[PDB]
Design a protein around this ligand. Sequence first.
Ligand SMILES: Clc1cccc(Cl)c1C1=NO[C@H]2[C@@H]3CC[C@@H](C3)[C@@H]12
Ligand SMILES: Clc1cccc(Cl)c1C1=NO[C@H]2[C@@H]3CC[C@@H](C3)[C@@H]12
Ligand SMILES: Clc1cccc(Cl)c1C1=NO[C@H]2[C@@H]3CC[C@@H](C3)[C@@H]12
Ligand SMILES: Clc1cccc(Cl)c1C1=NO[C@H]2[C@@H]3CC[C@@H](C3)[C@@H]12
Lengths: 451, 451, 451, 451
Amino acid sequence: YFFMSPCDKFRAKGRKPCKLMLQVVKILVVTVQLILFGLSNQLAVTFREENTIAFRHLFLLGYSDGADDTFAAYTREQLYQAIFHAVDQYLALPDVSLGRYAYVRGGGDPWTNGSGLALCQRYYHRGHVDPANDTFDIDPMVVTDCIQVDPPESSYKNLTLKFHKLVNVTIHFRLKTINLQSLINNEIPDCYTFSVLITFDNKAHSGRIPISLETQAHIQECKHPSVFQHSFRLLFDVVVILTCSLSFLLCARSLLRGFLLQNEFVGFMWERLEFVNGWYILLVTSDVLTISGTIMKIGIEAKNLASYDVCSILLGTSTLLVWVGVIRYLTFFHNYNILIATLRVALPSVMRFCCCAGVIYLGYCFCGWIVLGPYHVKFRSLSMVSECLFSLINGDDMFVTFAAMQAQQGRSSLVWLFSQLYLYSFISLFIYMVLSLFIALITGAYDTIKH
Amino acid sequence: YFFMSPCDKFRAKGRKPCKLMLQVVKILVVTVQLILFGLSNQLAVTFREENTIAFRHLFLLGYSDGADDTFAAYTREQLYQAIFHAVDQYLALPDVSLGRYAYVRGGGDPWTNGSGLALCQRYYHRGHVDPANDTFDIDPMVVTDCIQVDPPESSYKNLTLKFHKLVNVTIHFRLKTINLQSLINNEIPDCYTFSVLITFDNKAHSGRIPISLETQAHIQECKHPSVFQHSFRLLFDVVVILTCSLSFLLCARSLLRGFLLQNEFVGFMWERLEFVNGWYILLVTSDVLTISGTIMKIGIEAKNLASYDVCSILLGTSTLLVWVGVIRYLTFFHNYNILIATLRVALPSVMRFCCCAGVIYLGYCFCGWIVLGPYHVKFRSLSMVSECLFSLINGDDMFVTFAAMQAQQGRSSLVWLFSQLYLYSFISLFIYMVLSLFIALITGAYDTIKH
Amino acid sequence: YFFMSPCDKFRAKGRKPCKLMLQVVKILVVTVQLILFGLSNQLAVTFREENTIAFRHLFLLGYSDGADDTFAAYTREQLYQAIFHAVDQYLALPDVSLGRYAYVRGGGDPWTNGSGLALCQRYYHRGHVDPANDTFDIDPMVVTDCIQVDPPESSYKNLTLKFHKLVNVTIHFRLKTINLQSLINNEIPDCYTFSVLITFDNKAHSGRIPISLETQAHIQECKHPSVFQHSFRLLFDVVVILTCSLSFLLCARSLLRGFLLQNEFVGFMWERLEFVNGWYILLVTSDVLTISGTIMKIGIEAKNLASYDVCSILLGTSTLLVWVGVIRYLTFFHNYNILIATLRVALPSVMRFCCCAGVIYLGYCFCGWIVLGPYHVKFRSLSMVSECLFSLINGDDMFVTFAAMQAQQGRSSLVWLFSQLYLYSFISLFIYMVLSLFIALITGAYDTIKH
Amino acid sequence: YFFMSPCDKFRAKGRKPCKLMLQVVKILVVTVQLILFGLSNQLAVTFREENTIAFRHLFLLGYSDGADDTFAAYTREQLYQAIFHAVDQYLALPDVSLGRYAYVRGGGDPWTNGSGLALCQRYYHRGHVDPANDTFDIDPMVVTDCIQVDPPESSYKNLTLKFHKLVNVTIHFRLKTINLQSLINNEIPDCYTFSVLITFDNKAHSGRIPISLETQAHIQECKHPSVFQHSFRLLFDVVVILTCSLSFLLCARSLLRGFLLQNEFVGFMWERLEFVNGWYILLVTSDVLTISGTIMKIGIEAKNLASYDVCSILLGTSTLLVWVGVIRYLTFFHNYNILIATLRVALPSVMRFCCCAGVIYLGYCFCGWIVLGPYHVKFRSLSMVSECLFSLINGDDMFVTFAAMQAQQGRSSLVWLFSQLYLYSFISLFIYMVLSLFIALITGAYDTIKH
Ligand SMILES: Clc1cccc(Cl)c1C1=NO[C@H]2[C@@H]3CC[C@@H](C3)[C@@H]12
Ligand SMILES: Clc1cccc(Cl)c1C1=NO[C@H]2[C@@H]3CC[C@@H](C3)[C@@H]12
Ligand SMILES: Clc1cccc(Cl)c1C1=NO[C@H]2[C@@H]3CC[C@@H](C3)[C@@H]12
Ligand SMILES: Clc1cccc(Cl)c1C1=NO[C@H]2[C@@H]3CC[C@@H](C3)[C@@H]12
């Protein structure tokens, strides 16, 4: 038909395979670009993580590595000591810190003019809580009292906390640093502004106030730079864009020809989905994703985008798609095409059995959540329950799940017995039946392919 | 026959499928009710857990997060310091605690009138233990000496412990608090009474006295409440009850008609279990469970039931059952019905092989318990042994099991060799044979279904 | 033939199945005896473990739970402080300990008359080690200098350690205690003599001296006991012995009749292994094991055996065997016999493939040991390597194995690359081929059984 | 043909199997040599590890076991204290250490004449970093200022660190010790020179300076040794070499005869790869590896090679190969040859499906790296991503992977959703389809072998 023919068969009675060469070049350039981008991102992420760890060690009183989710205050003296230690360490940073930092001094909403640190309470507008008469009268609206501290170059120790009506206490300040680590990977050093927020959280009003530290980095270009002796990335990005544009044009032209031929055939006869060649759909999709991600990456490197997650997702999805596309060349042979056809034949029944098993799985997920949420730390949220069950049907973390309920045998024996029955039934049903049926489906598809 | 017919076939020669619509509505309402109940329970459980953690940090001397099962006293001075620290922290709570608590002051059996704390010894009536002459004379009956401490608004430091005859020392007090965290999820704040029990356990008489803290919360409604501006749950519960009642009535009427038709057929002829339609049995069971759980949940929200475990189990089992019921609609087609029929055909042989493999499994469980209980921390109880073996046949926690016995190679080499043989034999037998036979059973059932 | 017939078929043309009833009674009594013995052993083991933990906390300076394999001394002052603290805590035990202990005061080889504690050095007879001239002259023979301390009712702080030639330092003492915890499980309290050994080990001469504490309990009966109000076990043991003797006699008589019938058949004809009925061999073996274990258990309870490991192994193996014997009754039917016959048919090919795969497995074990012993903590000994590989082919502890070598990427990259190749090749080969062939063997056997 | 015949068939019409006996002897001697070498290496590795642990405990201020990757300095006072503590502990080692060590006193590049310790800064040649004006001017070239400390038998506390321009601080010294632990395994004690390097790493300039200690041991023979009473290894090594040489000669002669016979056959006829007998190729390869490894091991024991990794890899690969060679004798039968032929038939399709699945796997690896590197500690490098995914398709470490992303749900929900989709899709695709197809391939190959 000279259409739908295989490529080796076009070559026998036609032109050269000049469009299959373009695709492998696209795979090469996309992979190289992704690798380079990932290396640079690794460097930046390591810098930010190390700076945040140093900030925690400098500003959190009595902080040790690994005590992040449990780190909390339990007495009023503890809270006062933590707050004052954080402020004093802010005031002594140029003399005690191993890094080099600069003060920012306002220019924003939380901080007034000439103010570098903001110590602010947040409490209810009116709170009259007494448990002796079992009475209360609360106006929920949150009032903020902010204390401003000028960086060194007074009344922050006069702070009086409204403990019974407190919502949270927060400390806000920024630090300016220069990334000198970026020099090893060529490059010109960047200027980082770390926005540090320390939260003393009392929303639960349970007598336990967790303490956490978070940072938000804003990267700029340092004015007046000099490295005494110091385009490739931009040129490679435009090379990727040009190759992707050519691939998109060729695939679109091929799809248009296919649609025109389908229309001619349907006119002749006076199954339309068999004229589509979804490999080209995949190529076009990865093509658009690559182009969008490359523009976003160029902006990020030009320092005016700072949207790393979307660009990373776009480029990663495009790379995954272009690597999936080698199956197209693997089907051009026979001994690989038999396996690929086996998978293609097996897929629909696999999805249908996934529907049934997943309905049962959702039932088990809801039951496990509602029953073992109060007791099992692995069953707190619905997504956590789903992850636990999914890892449990694959033979992972089973004994810890059983032991976390053994640690309750003293408490409700009804709950312990229900947990035993639930876990045993679910694991047996999904290991001995569902996975075995998946294996049987694949084996049957392979048998039909061979026969 | 116009009975046992499929639904699409009733529609061709009869009425509309107005009872299949009722079931999906039931699934929707049951799932929504369960989700809402689970969210509220999550909030309450988090409040209780945080309060208990704060209590432990406030009252246990030298307590750190993670030291719960190992936390213990080893010297008489340590025991005295822990007890006195607990009592003093009880006396200083209004001045040191980050939360707001109120004293309860008796009104109960452990505490006398106007007493908030109870420090009580429990020792044998007569204990004369000497190991030098290898003699003893004990009257086991336990005597209690209770010390009552009035909350602040004297002789507890004169406590003298009968160490050689001591059974345990316990501290009992209650704290009243108001749940202000419940405001974020709408609601009117609840009043919590925490019953705190601190146990210094000396039942083993081994020179090691574990220390633990447990709480029991009693939730009431706060009299005279006010939130300045602040039925849906009750109405949705009665909606669920009404839908469930209608479903139960319809299923019961259908079952009665089926039984009458079976009786007519057996009269005509002058296999009875093939006239039952167990889908309707499942629907009725989930129906009764949902109604009972909804009444219990209404009582709990009305604050006069406080039986959370039974209601949660009822609602979770009902939700699991109603989600299993979508297989009924999946069998109405063909490509799903083949898989469901494969599972149905495979089930009996699976249960029979479960019987045989489980008999072997029980033999191994008893042997492993009796031999590795003294040495392996994973083999202490029969249920623990069963969980360990079950997770071991699924490829989980194998190397830790081997290493816990490698940590004994220095001690009995006979025991180490037996553990090696036992573990290797059990794992090989249950991985390479039993699971493979389960897979073979499912594959054979699939083959018969296709052929 | 009225021999080899099934039991339901004997009943049709003969007597009643009065020997199958005896076997289920044997299973019942053996299981009950094992459960009771296990409960008592649990109690004793818990007592010993708690006493040892208390001893460690009392006598090891700066000891914390979990620091058992890493607990060590690194300076001469540290060693001196640890030794003196141990001796002083021995001298202050009656005034500081929460338990009740008695001194033993000699009557043995390590301790002289009227001596309760033995502080002894062990050093080379002649040691002249200098690393400056790279010379040494050692006479390896170990000399012991023992210091005897009288229990309270002097020159141990004058100890001078020969550090350069030291082998080890050991402390030996005994404590007498009475097990009062045994009263809860009825019983009359036992008298325990704990032999405590503290070792300061310097055999490696590496500047790191590990410190460990071990105990050896010797349980006796307390003379002149009294519990004011306080045979079943002995009678149940003799009941088990009698039932086992009857079962052994019946099985032996049946085997003798079978051998006589085989001889008659071979005489008639002028395959011998098909006249054995190995079920009866299993019954006789479990019978002998049960009788031996019961005599040993009676001796242990009579307090003059103290050989717990052998008795536990005997009774556990017997219980496992008697529970395996229910397959005999499961084969009497058809739907269970098909599965059991499938396993019987599959077994020989499974063992042969085990031989081949195990030869490859031994090759991999030797290679992994010799290469990753110096670097990987999981590959230190051959048995550890075998356990690691066996758990690795079952999908357990794979990422930790990979990460322990990632923690070396900085050191030898040749070793890291070899570890990558070795692990990937071994896991792929034993997951995708060997286990799949085991599954194929079982599936084929099932197919032949059905066909 | 009297060629390609089986061995039992040669014996019927020819000579005795005198070359199969040589191979089992080779297996025996290779295994014994490897075991002995591994035991000696275990001893040496344990000595080095214990010495390094003692060095860390002696020289790192506030160091605890397990704090190796997190151990770091955060303040200038902390850095100064750590450096001075390390130097002072170097100066007090002969009086405080439990081991026996000797000073080395120069004779090298880092240390001047008569200097044992080198305290050296490394900073940029010109560093003018200010973040207030967002300006810098750096000359990257690294300048070193070395402080030399004479071992005891002054101005190191006058050290002034250029914090803003610092790269790293390093301490270099050597210690001489004699391995007395080697005496237990016979042997004459060795002389060890430990090269100790302590690094205070500030390459990231993030305010966090990690501290690490590494050692490099150089083992010599101690001059003038004496153990008062104290060839087998050398003789056994030459025995292995001789057996290997004979095996290599026989296999080479057989291969030459096979090639000559192939040439004669191709001349007669006027498939060549079927005259090779790759078993002999494997034997020759393991033979060369064994000989090379044995020469290297003899050199190492003679103390003038010190190249342990290459020798260990050579000997381990040779042992693995010689153990793989028992399959040759297992194929000589029939019931084993069927299984081996099944594996041989299945192998090519397995490799082709490995190609396809690995292309998809590489796509997923790149996507997972680029997206979850910034957030997931398990996805930092490409090799780490590959190990994580490979262990994830085998049911290992799944819930920890899910939980490390649950710990981010608060941060980017787009990233969390992408991680959920990515993990679920990858695990489902590679568990329910790829492994099932591998099983189907093996089952089909087994079916063709039987039929
Ligand atoms: Cl329902 C669901 C929720 C969340 C995540 C997943 Cl992977 C699922 C499932 N998709 O289909 C089934 C299949 C059988 C248990 C898994 C695999 C289940
Ligand atoms: Cl016996 C038993 C006790 C406790 C829990 C369970 Cl899941 C069982 C079993 N039920 O049947 C067998 C099947 C083969 C090992 C499991 C699965 C075993
Ligand atoms: Cl060789 C060996 C040594 C130690 C322990 C065991 Cl379980 C073995 C094996 N027995 O046969 C094979 C089978 C394939 C890997 C296991 C299972 C291997
Ligand atoms: Cl691509 C790759 C990179 C690194 C390590 C390995 Cl093991 C591989 C693979 N080799 O082929 C496939 C097969 C399917 C997932 C594994 C097994 C994959």
